[PDB]
């Protein structure tokens, strides 16, 4: 089997993106953050607290005839930014983009943090890491692609998404049209849980490559690219007027400016974000101070390729027996 689903920027600057999920019979179609760094999927639900619901779509597993309470378990999560949900736990028939899965934990949220409610435009999370990461208890829960691998033509999905405009998921296949060139394919460590993997380098803009290892974890539910500070160092220092504002919480540049390109190596293979994707915006409307989309992870504990460098790429989540990861420019 296989699936194709397109995600859709939820907003003009990319902070998220979103793709139709199918719950339950009849369906319920919500909108889920597809998240290759954490390895629940939750939803905003019949369940969660009322004044925590402001806008999402809910799914009610009372209407679904194929819903089943998972008897005793619970979960809760904290994510790297702070946010966090809770509550309990259905098994019910989850599909995307036509690949159906029967008996996937459908987490229901009874509380979320304010982060989540604040965004109306994301119904839930559907997990992508591995499925030592998934926080249901007492007995852990498999993601989605972990119960479909078996089934898929190919034990793989990729990620294609969009610059300001929408891109797509699929599963057990790779499209030979949607990348040029070949892909690379780089080792994965699962140790953390993670699509952990090594960099072999970077450049700024149209300057010489400096050959050097960065670590770190491929996570199409974080916005920005988290990089070491010497690196985040060099390429704002390219930026005419950009710093790091301790105020805002990270670089910031004129908006007046035009950005610089950043590439980073995959083995011997080369990805180039272009600077426009580096433009986060205003830091508050009206303002002429820009946010920038490359920051410093040195308060994270590791270094996250999250959207601004997938987005560059069309990118191979390879789940054989020994995972790998793959990137082609597009």
């Given at each position: 089997?296989?699936?194709?689903?397109?995600?859709?920027?939820?907003?003009?600057?990319?902070?998220?993106?979103?793709?139709?999920?199918?719950?339950?019979?009849?369906?319920?179609?919500?909108?889920?953050?597809?998240?290759?760094?954490?390895?629940?999927?939750?939803?905003?639900?019949?369940?969660?607290?009322?004044?925590?619901?402001?806008?999402?779509?809910?799914?009610?597993?009372?209407?679904?005839?194929?819903?089943?309470?998972?008897?005793?378990?619970?979960?809760?999560?904290?994510?790297?930014?702070?946010?966090?949900?809770?509550?309990?736990?259905?098994?019910?028939?989850?599909?995307?983009?036509?690949?159906?899965?029967?008996?996937?934990?459908?987490?229901?949220?009874?509380?979320?943090?304010?982060?989540?409610?604040?965004?109306?435009?994301?119904?839930?999370?559907?997990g992508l890491a591995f499925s030592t990461l998934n926080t249901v208890s007492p007995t852990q829960q498999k993601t989605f692609f972990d119960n479909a691998k078996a089934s898929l033509d190919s034990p793989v999905f990729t990620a294609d998404l969009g610059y300001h405009a929408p891109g797509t998921y699929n599963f057990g296949?790779?499209?030979?049209?949607?990348?040029?060139?070949?892909?690379?394919?780089?080792?994965?460590?699962?140790?953390?849980?993670?699509?952990?993997?090594?960099?072999?380098?970077?450049?700024?803009?149209?300057?010489?490559?400096?050959?050097?290892?960065?670590?770190?974890?491929?996570?199409?539910?974080?916005?920005?690219?988290?990089?070491?500070?010497?690196?985040?160092?060099?390429?704002?220092?390219?930026?005419?007027?950009?710093?790091?504002?301790?105020?805002?919480?990270?670089?910031?540049?004129?908006?007046?400016?035009?950005?610089?390109?950043?590439?980073?190596?995959?083995?011997?293979?080369?990805?180039?974000?272009?600077?426009?994707?580096?433009?986060?915006?205003?830091?508050?409307?009206?303002?002429?101070?820009?946010?920038?989309?490359?920051?410093?992870?040195?308060?994270?504990?590791?270094?996250?390729?999250?959207?601004?460098?997938?987005?560059?790429?069309?990118?191979?989540?390879?789940?054989?027996?020994?995972?790998?990861?793959?990137?082609?420019?597009?």
């Amino acid at each position: 089997s296989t699936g194709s689903a397109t995600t859709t920027p939820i907003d003009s600057l990319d902070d998220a993106y979103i793709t139709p999920v199918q719950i339950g019979t009849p369906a319920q179609t919500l909108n889920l953050d597809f998240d290759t760094g954490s390895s629940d999927l939750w939803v905003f639900s019949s369940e969660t607290t009322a004044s925590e619901v402001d806008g999402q779509t809910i799914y009610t597993p009372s209407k679904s005839t194929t819903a089943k309470l998972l008897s005793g378990a619970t979960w809760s999560i904290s994510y790297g930014d702070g946010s966090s949900s809770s509550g309990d736990v259905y098994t019910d028939t989850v599909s995307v983009g036509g690949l159906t899965v029967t008996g996937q934990a459908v987490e229901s949220a009874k509380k979320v943090s304010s982060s989540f409610t604040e965004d109306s435009t994301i119904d839930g999370l559907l997990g992508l890491a591995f499925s030592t990461l998934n926080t249901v208890s007492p007995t852990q829960q498999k993601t989605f692609f972990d119960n479909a691998k078996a089934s898929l033509d190919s034990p793989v999905f990729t990620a294609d998404l969009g610059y300001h405009a929408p891109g797509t998921y699929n599963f057990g296949f790779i499209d030979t049209t949607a990348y040029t060139g070949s892909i690379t394919y780089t080792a994965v460590s699962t140790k953390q849980g993670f699509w952990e993997w090594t960099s072999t380098g970077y450049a700024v803009g149209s300057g010489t490559f400096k050959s050097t290892s960065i670590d770190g974890i491929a996570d199409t539910g974080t916005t920005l690219l988290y990089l070491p500070a010497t690196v985040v160092s060099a390429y704002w220092a390219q930026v005419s007027g950009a710093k790091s504002s301790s105020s805002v919480g990270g670089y910031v540049f004129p908006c007046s400016a035009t950005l610089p390109s950043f590439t980073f190596g995959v083995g011997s293979a080369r990805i180039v974000i272009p600077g426009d994707y580096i433009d986060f915006g205003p830091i508050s409307t009206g303002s002429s101070s820009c946010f920038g989309g490359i920051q410093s992870s040195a308060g994270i504990g590791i270094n996250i390729f999250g959207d601004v460098a997938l987005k560059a790429a069309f990118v191979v989540f390879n789940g054989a027996t020994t995972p790998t990861l793959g990137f082609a420019s597009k």
